Amino acid sequence: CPLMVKVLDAVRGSPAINVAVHVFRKAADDTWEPFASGKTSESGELHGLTTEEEFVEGIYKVEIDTKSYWKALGISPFHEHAEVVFTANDSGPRRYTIAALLSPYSYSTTAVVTN
Amino acid sequence: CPLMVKVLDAVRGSPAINVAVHVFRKAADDTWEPFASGKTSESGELHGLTTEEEFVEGIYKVEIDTKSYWKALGISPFHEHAEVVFTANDSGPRRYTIAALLSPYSYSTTAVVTNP
Amino acid sequence: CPLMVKVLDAVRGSPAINVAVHVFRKAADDTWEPFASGKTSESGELHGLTTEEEFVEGIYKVEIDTKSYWKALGISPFHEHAEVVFTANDSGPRRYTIAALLSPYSYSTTAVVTNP
Amino acid sequence: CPLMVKVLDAVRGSPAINVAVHVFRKAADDTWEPFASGKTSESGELHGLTTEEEFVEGIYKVEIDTKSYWKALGISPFHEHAEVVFTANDSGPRRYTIAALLSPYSYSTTAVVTN
Numbered sequence: 001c002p003l004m005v006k007v008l009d010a011v012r013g014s015p016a017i018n019v020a021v022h023v024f025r026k027a028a029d030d031t032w033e034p035f036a037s038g039k040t041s042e043s044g045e046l047h048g049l050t051t052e053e054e055f056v057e058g059i060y061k062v063e064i065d066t067k068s069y070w071k072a073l074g075i076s077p078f079h080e081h082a083e084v085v086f087t088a089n090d091s092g093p094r095r096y097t098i099a100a101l102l103s104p105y106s107y108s109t110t111a112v113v114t115n
Numbered sequence: 116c117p118l119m120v121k122v123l124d125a126v127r128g129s130p131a132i133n134v135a136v137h138v139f140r141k142a143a144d145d146t147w148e149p150f151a152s153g154k155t156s157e158s159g160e161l162h163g164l165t166t167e168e169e170f171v172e173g174i175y176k177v178e179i180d181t182k183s184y185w186k187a188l189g190i191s192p193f194h195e196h197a198e199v200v201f202t203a204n205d206s207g208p209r210r211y212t213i214a215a216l217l218s219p220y221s222y223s224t225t226a227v228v229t230n231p
Numbered sequence: 232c233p234l235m236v237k238v239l240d241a242v243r244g245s246p247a248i249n250v251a252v253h254v255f256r257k258a259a260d261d262t263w264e265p266f267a268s269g270k271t272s273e274s275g276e277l278h279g280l281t282t283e284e285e286f287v288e289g290i291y292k293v294e295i296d297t298k299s300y301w302k303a304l305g306i307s308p309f310h311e312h313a314e315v316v317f318t319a320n321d322s323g324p325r326r327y328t329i330a331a332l333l334s335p336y337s338y339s340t341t342a343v344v345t346n347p
Numbered sequence: 348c349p350l351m352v353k354v355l356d357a358v359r360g361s362p363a364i365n366v367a368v369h370v371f372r373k374a375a376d377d378t379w380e381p382f383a384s385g386k387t388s389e390s391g392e393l394h395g396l397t398t399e400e401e402f403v404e405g406i407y408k409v410e411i412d413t414k415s416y417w418k419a420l421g422i423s424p425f426h427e428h429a430e431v432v433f434t435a436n437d438s439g440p441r442r443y444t445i446a447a448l449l450s451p452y453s454y455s456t457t458a459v460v461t462n
C-alpha cells in the first residue's frame with residue numbers, strides 16, 4: 001500500500017468517518033487527472049487507493065471533502081475542501097501516509113513517509 | 116483590509132518572510148482566474164491584496180508557495196504549496212485572515228473571520 | 232512587550248476571548264512559583280504580563296485555561312488546559328509570542344521568538 | 348489497551364522514534380504521581396502503558412520529552428516538553444490515543460477516543 005489517507009476530527013475526538021477523498025495526478029498538459037478515490041472507513045482511513053506499479057513519480061493532489069463532512073454533522077465550516085499537493089519521489093522504497101486533522105475553521109496535514 | 120495572509124515558520128519560531136502568495140477566484144466558467152498576489156513581509160504578513168469593492172462574493176483560492184520557501188533554507192519539503200479554498204462574502208463583507216504554520220512535512224492553516 | 236499570548240478558536244474562526252492564562256516560573260527549589268496572569272482580550276491577545284526587567288532567565292510555564300473556555304460555549308472538551316513550558320532569555324532578552332489554536336479535542340501551540 | 352501515545356515528526360515526515368513519555372496521575376494531595384512510562388517504538392507508538400483495571404477515572408498528565416528528541420537530532424527546540432493533561436471519564440467503554448505532531452517551535456496534540 002504505497003498511499004494511505006487518514007483523517008481525524010478535532011471537534012469530536014474521533015476518526016472522521018465517511019469523508020470523500022479524491023486523488024489526482026498532474027498530466028503533461030498540467031491539468032489534474034482523476035487517479036483514485038474513496039470514502040474514509042470507520043477508523044478514518046482510506047486504503048487501497050493505488051498499487052506500487054501505478055504510483056509512479058509525479059505530482060499528486062489529495063482532495064479531502066471537509067465541507068460536506070462538517071455540513072453532515074450540522075456544523076458550519078470555512079474551507080471548501082482540504083487539498084494536499086506533493087511530488088512522489090522514488091529514493092529507495094517508500095510508503096506515504098497523508099494525515100489530516102480537521103476543525104471547522106482550521107486543518108492540519110502531515111506526511112509520514114516510511115520504508 | 117478584507118484579506119490578509121500571515122505565515123509562520125515552526126522550525127525557526129519566526130515569521131516566514133518573503134513567501135510568495137497567489138490568490139485566485141473561481142470564474143463563471145469554473146476556471147481559477149488570477150485575483151491578487153504578493154509576498155510576505157518581515158513580519159510574515161501580506162496586506163493590501165484587495166479592497167472591499169473588489170473582493171466580491173465568490174470561491175477563492177489562496178496558494179502559499181511553501182516549497183520555494185523551504186528550499187531556500189536548505190530543506191527539501193514534502194508539499195508543493197499550501198492551498199486554502201473558501202467561499203467569501205456570501206453573507207456580506209467580512210474580513211479574512213488566512214494564517215499558515217509551516218513545517219517541512221506538515222502545515223496547518225486557520226481562518227479568522229470578523230464582521231467589520 | 233517581552234511576553235504575549237494569543238489564542239484562537241478553530242471551531243468559530245475567531246479570537247478566543249476571555250481565556251484565563253497563568254504564568255509560572257520555576258524557583259530555586261524546583262517549585263512552580265506564580266509569575267503573572269491575565270485574560271485574553273476581544274482580539275484573543277494578552278499583553279502586559281511582565282516587563283523586560285522582571286522577565287529574567289528561567290524556565291516558564293504558560294497555562295491556558297481551555298477547559299473553562301469550551302465549557303462556557305457548551306462543549307465538554309478533552310484537555311484540562313494547555314501548558315507551554317520553555318526556557319526563556321538564556322541568551323539574553325528576547326520577545327516571546329505564545330500562540331495557541333484551540334479545538335475541543337486538540338490544540339496546537341507555537342512560539343514566535345524575536346530579538347529586540 | 349486503554350491508553351496509547353503516538354508521536355510524529357513534522358521536520359522529517361516520520362514517526363518520532365525513541366521519545367521518552369511519562370504518564371502521571373493526579374493524587375489526592377494534588378501532586379503528580381508517576382503512573383507509567385516508556386519510549387516510543389520505531390512506529391512512533393507507545394503501547395502497554397496500563398490496563399483497564401488500573402486506568403480508573405482521574406486526571407492524567409502525559410509528558411513527552413520533546414527537547415531531548417530535537418537535541419539528539421542536532422536541532423534547537425523551544426519547549427522543555429509537551430504536556431497533555433486530561434480527565435479520564437468512564438461513559439461506556441473507552442480507548443484513548445494521545446497523538447502529538449512535533450516541530451522545533453510548535454507542537455499539536457489531539458485525542459482520539461473510541462469504543
Ligand SMILES: O=c1cc(-c2ccc(O)c(O)c2)oc2cc(Cl)cc(O)c12
Binds near residue numbers: 108455457459
Ligand atoms: O496528533 C496527531 C495524530 C495523528 C495521527 C496520525 C495517524 C494515526 O494513525 C493516528 O492515530 C494519529 O495525525 C496528526 C496529523 C496532524 Cl496534521 C496533526 C496532528 O496533531 C496529528
Ligand SMILES: O=c1cc(-c2ccc(O)c(O)c2)oc2cc(Cl)cc(O)c12
Binds near residue numbers: 121212223330341
Ligand atoms: O499558534 C498559532 C498562531 C497564529 C497567529 C499568530 C498571530 C496572529 O496575529 C494570528 O492571526 C495568528 O496562527 C496560527 C495558525 C495556525 Cl494554522 C496554527 C497555529 O498554531 C497558529
Ligand code: NA
Binds near residue numbers: 205206
Ligand atoms: Na448570500
Ligand code: NA
Binds near residue numbers: 321322323
Ligand atoms: Na546563558
